[PDB]
């Protein structure tokens, strides 16, 4: 679970405890553990007796979470709680790196999240794919408090403006059956109100200034996209690289998963850009 901006004590008090109360008493449960970090993410691991069906364990735990789901805060509730059967230890790590340093942190991290993660997650026997040190790919509007205050706006005003100007609406169809006499044609109607690009988001109107000029979103905030523009932190040897972690599902064969991931990565490397290379130096399966 994720609670953005919440300190570890609040997460454990308000999120971990309600979840643990619902999760206890699950059949064949050995022990459970919860770790809440300052990053706003709570991880709860439930360990079952050996021989327990991993599929039955997941659905039972996921159903307990859905019950406690109403007790959780709205911010935690909005993002959702993910329950997955998953080995708590790394099975294989795939590294993406530029041999001559052609690309920066943003390019490789975005490539892994957009064009590597989804392909790997589709493989059988995969429990979870994690890009270490990389955030999620999303809109990120970096407000400037001084600029917003100068324009005569507050943080709530800015947020509400983009909530109402990016909405989805359905518009029915023409010539419906409630007509007194039968119609000849039926045409669907498409009403669109969503936004897709940074320039579209930068064009969101906040207010009309005293001079008649329309205050757009880009006037006060640094609009950005991607999974995070901060410098690369994961390393291979001593160079900079993007580490992709693969956790096997319980009961899945480790040998087959390592082969499947390596086979898929070979296929993906065919359409790799120039000076882009991949390797998997860390693989306990090869010892097996």
């Amino acid at each position: 679970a994720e609670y953005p901006g919440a300190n570890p004590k609040v997460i454990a008090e308000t999120v971990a405890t309600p979840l643990e109360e619902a999760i206890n008493g699950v059949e064949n449960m050995m022990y459970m553990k919860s770790v809440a970090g300052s990053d706003g993410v709570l991880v709860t691991t439930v360990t079952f007796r050996p021989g327990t069906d991993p599929d039955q364990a997941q659905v039972q735990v996921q159903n307990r979470v859905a019950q406690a789901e109403a007790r959780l805060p709205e911010d935690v509730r909005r993002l959702g709680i993910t329950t997955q059967k998953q080995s708590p230890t790394l099975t294989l790590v795939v590294h993406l790196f530029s041999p001559n340093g052609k690309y920066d942190s943003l390019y490789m991290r975005n490539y892994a999240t957009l064009k590597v993660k989804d392909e790997l997650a589709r493989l059988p026997g995969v429990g979870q794919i994690q890009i270490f040190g990389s955030g999620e790919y999303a809109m990120r509007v970096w407000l400037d408090p001084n600029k917003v205050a100068a324009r005569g706006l507050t943080a709530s005003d800015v947020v509400t403006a983009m909530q109402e100007q990016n909405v989805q609406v359905s518009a029915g169809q023409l010539g419906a059956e409630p007509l007194p006499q039968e119609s000849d044609f039926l045409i669907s109607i498409n009403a669109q109100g969503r936004l897709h690009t940074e320039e579209e988001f930068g064009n969101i109107i906040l207010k009309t200034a005293q001079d008649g000029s329309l205050v757009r979103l880009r006037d006060v905030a640094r609009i950005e996209m991607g999974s995070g523009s901060y410098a690369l932190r994961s390393q291979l040897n001593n160079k900079d690289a993007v580490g992709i972690g693969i956790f096997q599902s319980p009961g899945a064969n480790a040998i087959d998963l390592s082969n499947a991931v390596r086979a898929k990565m070979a296929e993906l490397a065919t359409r790799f850009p120039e000076d882009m290379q991949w390797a998997a130096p860390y693989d306990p399966t090869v010892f097996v």
Binding site: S38, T89, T91, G133, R233, Q235, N238, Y282, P284
Partner: protein
């Protein structure tokens, strides 16, 4: 198992920049040592929990095939653990891989000190400090 598990624990409140500087030192020490094939570093990733923490790090030291070296894993681990003990910025460590892959984070024992009496986080912290001292005093045991 042709690899070792290492980590670091910087003083509380340290930024990720300080942790990364020490982690890059451990990766240099590891690759310098003979018998080490590679070094995979994850600054900000806790070794014992795999959760993000600013003042912790994780390094995986790959080892060459058994015929390519005259040192066993325990000798390499002891050599690295002695060298990384010279880093004064933060506490460093290195452990052997767990006997059963997929069960445990490393070799040795593993326990949790539960606080069932509501004594608070301060009392729980004191017990950890007391327990680590006693374990260090016992001969034949390393620092937990």
């Amino acid at each position: 198992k042709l690899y070792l598990i290492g980590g670091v624990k910087m003083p509380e409140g340290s930024s990720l920049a300080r942790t990364d500087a020490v982690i890059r030192k451990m990766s240099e020490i590891g690759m310098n040592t003979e018998g080490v094939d590679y070094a995979v570093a994850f600054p900000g990733l806790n070794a014992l929990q795999f959760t993000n923490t600013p003042n912790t790090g994780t390094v995986f030291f790959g080892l060459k095939p058994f015929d390519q070296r005259k040192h066993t894993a325990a000798e390499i681990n002891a050599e690295i653990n002695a060298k990384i003990a010279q880093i004064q910025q933060g506490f460093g460590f290195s452990i052997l891989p767990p006997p059963i892959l997929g069960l445990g984070q490393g070799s040795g024992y593993s326990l949790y000190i539960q606080d069932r009496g509501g004594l608070g986080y301060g009392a729980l912290q004191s017990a950890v400090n007391a327990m680590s001292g006693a374990i260090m005093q016992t001969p034949g045991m390393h620092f937990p």
